[PDB]
Design a protein around this nucleic acid. Structure first.
Lengths: 159, 146, 98, 46, 113, 122, 53
RNA sequence: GAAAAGUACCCCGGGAGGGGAGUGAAAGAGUACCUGAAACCGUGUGCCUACAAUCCGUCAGAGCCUCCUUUUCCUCUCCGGAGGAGGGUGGUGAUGGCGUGCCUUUUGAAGAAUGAGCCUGCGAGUCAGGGACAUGUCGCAAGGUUAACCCGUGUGGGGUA
RNA sequence: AUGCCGUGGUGUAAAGCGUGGCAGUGAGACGGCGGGGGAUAAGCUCCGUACGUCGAAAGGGAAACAGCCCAGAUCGCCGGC
RNA sequence: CGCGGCACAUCCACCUUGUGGUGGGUGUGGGUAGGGGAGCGUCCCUCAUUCAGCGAAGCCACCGGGUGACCGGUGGUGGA
């Protein structure tokens, strides 16, 4: 946001008349060039988003995933829990033993028992459900982790 | 580059011109170039080089009477009017040395070296030159070739 | 001593005489033959091609010393015109032995 | 990855900043006259 | 070579150029004769300076352990101090500014047998 | 994103003043006054390198004239003769010879005198 | 009448520097005790003890 | 200044202020206080300047001064560059040539045509809209595309009117 | 006489035409050659010329000089004509 | 004209024998309003990498560097 002429209080007075003053053509005290003045062509609060084709989004996403698969960066898992309760410790040991990398993207689904709990507090680790699978995360993370259920729904959705 | 403009590397000898039959123009010109040093391969306009020139018998400078009685010299004061207009022949009867000197000064460049050079000039109306302690070197005029 | 013609220019040289010249095809230690215009042994003064094409100046190159850096712009007047650029001529140093 | 990711040649041409000197475009840098045009865009109809 | 002593006064209510006018009299002069001069300066603005020089004598003699009789004013400064300002009315509503300029005086003394 | 443009100004500002040292008065103290003088200074240098070349030619020529007249020959006939002989020697080194070795200069004069045809006829 | 232009730094300093005080003093001034120095003009008063420091 | 540890004490001084001690990692952190720019004032000092006129410079360019390499040499030499010659950075720059300040606006300007005292900071071609014409490039391919709205969490999937 | 339309050969990195996008100019001055107004006038003014230059072009020369004469600077050179 | 260094079109020969470049030759390169093309620098964000209280940034001076908008290095102050 910003603030310009008309939003600033005052400035409608026109002192220092136009002859016999030895002064400038003032016209207002809140004009840009005076301190305490308004902003010219300032940062109006733009709400913007580059609306794109669904075809472009889908092609980019499957493209990046195909690059990770070609590079051997896919880690398909079945689950992640010591039965029921979460364990940051256990997931850390498992993932550090498997991927050996910093930045990890995890896809589980709507399963909060340990899938969406053990992965927290892990610098560089993000987790999401397939329907929210963007490309920025995928391109950032190298060793991409997928659940079986994630692949089942995702693949079925994409035939 | 150059090797002349070096402090101490200036030979200032005393040349003497018995300027009787010689005309004013040619006289002043020869004195001018000779005095400034254009006869030397070490001429360097940035410095006060050259040799000293002595003018003898300045009263006898070959000036046509047709100009003695028409050519005038003007010395303005700085005051209204104040134009001290005076005949060149009268100046020859009084102070011909001023006549010759003036003629040379108008042939030298409008600069400070004009003054540093001017102070190297000695002009005496008479034949006898008091300064003989140094080596007078009589100089004669010519047209070189071509 | 002798006058050597090089780089389109004439330089006064002598045996064992370092002089800055124009850029030419050389490296670090090569005797490049250069023609002369005049040879002076102290009394004898040459003139013709019989000598000029007979002797030359063979000097080695110890390095490629760059020239002075020129910072320049052209400024005209009230028009509004500032042509900014630079230039530095690449030279090479010649140690005369011949 | 993102450190390799780059765009296609020919897109994303530099925005032309106008009133930013003589080396770029000029002091008036487009409205190079002194009539109406220097203050107002003229109706194409009129 | 010259183990000098330094004394100075800050926030003095004396105009710089007036101080300069005074201190130009004492450059290179002995302390006792300079102070005599300042005692008999008709400028009637040498007082503070004489006080400062006196502080040079006290420091040089007591802190440094030197003999006052041999002290010479090596150098003296008339530095421009914090200027304040106060407004003065004039005719026709003209609001002029009268300034209150101050200075910082630095004195260096040293033994020069 | 307010950028606070000072740094960009200070770069060229100090860059100009440190090169502006040597001018008198405000010309070596103030940016906007120093800037102007450098515009004219550099135009002057631009033309003056060319003038420098020509002026050095004139000094070299003048000295050659002096030596030639001491050898009872004018510049015109000297150069004409050198052309007829074929002495492709510059005026720069010719003048240097004219100073450090008048004898060789005179020898070149004798060459030119020999090379001249006869007179002002053709 | 006004200054049409600024006076150059040089000339302003010349005029400013042509603003000085005089120097007058006397040595050998004998009074009671310490030989305090005064100016010649007030010497007689010093001999009569009509000064104070 | 992390903390008040707020310079006890002593000495000039009417006091303010300062100095010597001292605290503090630091006082180049002293209430007037992080860094402390520029205009500006001022001290010291290398060079030039009181017979000379030019937008106040540039190019030539002497001779001094600072620094510095090689070298005769000081052989005191297992020390050093003292001094000197020569050579070479960075100042000053005697003296000569050359040359009518910026910008704006004008057929035409250095202007006796206008505006600027100097420094610092700020200050003027940008943004919304599935707007419109043309263009480069990227998806698809007689197709392409969704808006509103829904679901969902990083803004993903639906949604054919 | 010049000038102009059109054709056929010749010569020249190339200019031109049509088609789209984005601007400026829309007050001109002088000189050369032809003309009107004015007095056989003007540093006057209104036109014409596939005449130039300045304007937007620095440099040389004309003492100095935007418009005349020569000459169209990429940069450097202590090289020549 | 000579002796050398940059640049845009074009001709020729090569690398993808115009993606874009490499080697050579000719001609070209005064320019305001103004059109076109490629660039310099500052602040912020993301990603990767990386120096840093064994002293960052800012500032001052010095020595060098690029064709340009400018840069790098060294030293001092200061302290994130």
């Amino acid at each position: 946001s910003t603030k310009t002429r008309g939003e600033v209080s005052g400035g409608g007075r026109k002192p220092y008349r136009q002859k016999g003053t030895g002064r400038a053509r003032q016209g207002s005290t809140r004009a840009p060039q005076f301190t305490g003045g308004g902003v010219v062509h300032g940062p109006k609060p733009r709400d913007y988003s580059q609306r794109t084709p669904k075809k472009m989004i889908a092609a980019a996403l499957r493209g990046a995933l195909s690059d990770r698969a070609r590079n051997g960066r896919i880690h398909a898992i079945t689950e992640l829990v010591e039965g029921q309760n979460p364990s940051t410790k256990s997931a850390r040991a498992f993932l550090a033993s498997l991927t050996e990398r910093k930045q990890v993207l995890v896809v589980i689904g709507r399963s909060d028992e340990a899938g969406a709990k053990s992965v927290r507090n892990l610098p560089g680790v993000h987790i999401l459900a397939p329907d929210q699978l963007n490309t920025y995360d995928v391109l950032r993370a190298d060793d991409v982790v997928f659940s079986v259920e994630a692949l089942n729904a995702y693949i079925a959705a994409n035939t | 580059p150059t090797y002349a403009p070096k402090a101490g590397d200036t030979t200032r000898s005393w040349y003497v011109i018995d300027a009787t039959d010689v005309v004013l123009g040619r006289l002043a010109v020869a004195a001018a170039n000779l005095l400034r040093g254009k006869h030397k391969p070490t001429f360097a306009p940035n410095v006060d080089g050259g040799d000293f020139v002595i003018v003898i018998n300045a009263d006898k400078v070959a000036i046509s009477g047709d100009k003695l009685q028409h050519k005038m010299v003007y010395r303005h004061s700085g005051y209204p009017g104040g134009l001290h207009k005076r005949t060149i022949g009268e100046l020859m009867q009084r102070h011909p040395d001023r006549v010759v000197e003036k003629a040379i000064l108008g042939m030298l460049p409008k600069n400070r070296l004009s003054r540093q050079i001017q102070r190297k000039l000695r002009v005496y109306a008479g034949p006898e030159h008091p300064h003989s302690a140094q080596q007078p070197v009589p100089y004669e005029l010519k047209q070189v070739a071509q | 001593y002798a006058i050597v013609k090089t780089g389109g220019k004439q330089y006064k040289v002598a045996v064992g005489d370092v002089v800055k010249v124009e850029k030419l095809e050389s490296e670090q230690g090569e005797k490049v033959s250069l023609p002369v215009a005049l040879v002076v042994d102290g009394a004898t003064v040459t003139t013709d091609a019989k000598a000029l094409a007979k002797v030359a100046v063979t000097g080695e190159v110890l390095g490629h010393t760059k020239g002075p850096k020129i910072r320049i712009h052209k400024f005209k007047n009230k028009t509004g015109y500032h042509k900014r650029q630079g230039h530095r001529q690449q030279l090479t140093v010649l140690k005369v032995t011949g | 990855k993102l450190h390799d990711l780059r765009p296609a040649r020919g897109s994303k041409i530099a925005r032309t900043r106008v009133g930013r000197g003589d080396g770029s475009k000029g002091k008036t840098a487009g409205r190079g006259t002194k009539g109406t045009r220097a203050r107002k865009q003229v109706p194409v109809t009129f | 070579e010259y183990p000098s002593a330094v004394a100075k006064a800050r926030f003095v209510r004396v105009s710089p150029r007036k101080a300069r006018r005074v201190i130009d009299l004492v450059r290179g002069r002995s302390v006792s004769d300079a102070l005599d001069i300042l005692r008999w300066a008709p400028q009637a603005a040498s007082g503070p300076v004489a006080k400062v020089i006196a502080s040079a004598a006290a420091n040089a003699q007591n802190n440094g352990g030197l003999d006052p009789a041999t002290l010479v004013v090596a150098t003296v400064y008339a530095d421009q101090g914090p200027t304040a300002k106060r407004i003065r009315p004039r005719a026709q509503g003209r609001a002029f500014r009268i300034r209150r300029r101050t200075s910082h005086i630095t004195v260096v003394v040293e033994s020069r047998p | 994103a307010r950028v606070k443009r000072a740094v960009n100004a200070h770069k060229k500002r100090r860059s100009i003043l440190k090169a502006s040292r040597g001018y008198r008065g405000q010309r070596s103290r103030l940016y906007r006054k120093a800037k102007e003088q450098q515009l004219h200074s550099l135009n002057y240098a631009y033309r003056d390198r060319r003038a420098r070349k020509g002026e050095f030619r004139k000094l070299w020529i003048a000295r050659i004239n002096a030596a030639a007249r001491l050898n009872d020959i004018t510049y015109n006939r000297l150069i004409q003769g050198l052309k007829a002989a074929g002495v492709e020697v510059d005026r720069k080194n010719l003048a240097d010879i004219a100073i450090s070795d008048p004898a060789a200069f005179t020898a070149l004069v004798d060459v030119a005198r020999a090379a001249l045809p006869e007179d002002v006829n053709a | 009448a006004v200054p049409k232009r600024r006076k150059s730094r040089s000339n302003t300093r010349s005029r400013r520097s042509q603003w000085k005080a005089a120097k007058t003093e006397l040595v050998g001034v004998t009074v009671a005790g310490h030989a305090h120095k005064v100016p010649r003009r007030l010497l007689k008063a010093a001999r009569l003890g009509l000064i104070d420091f």
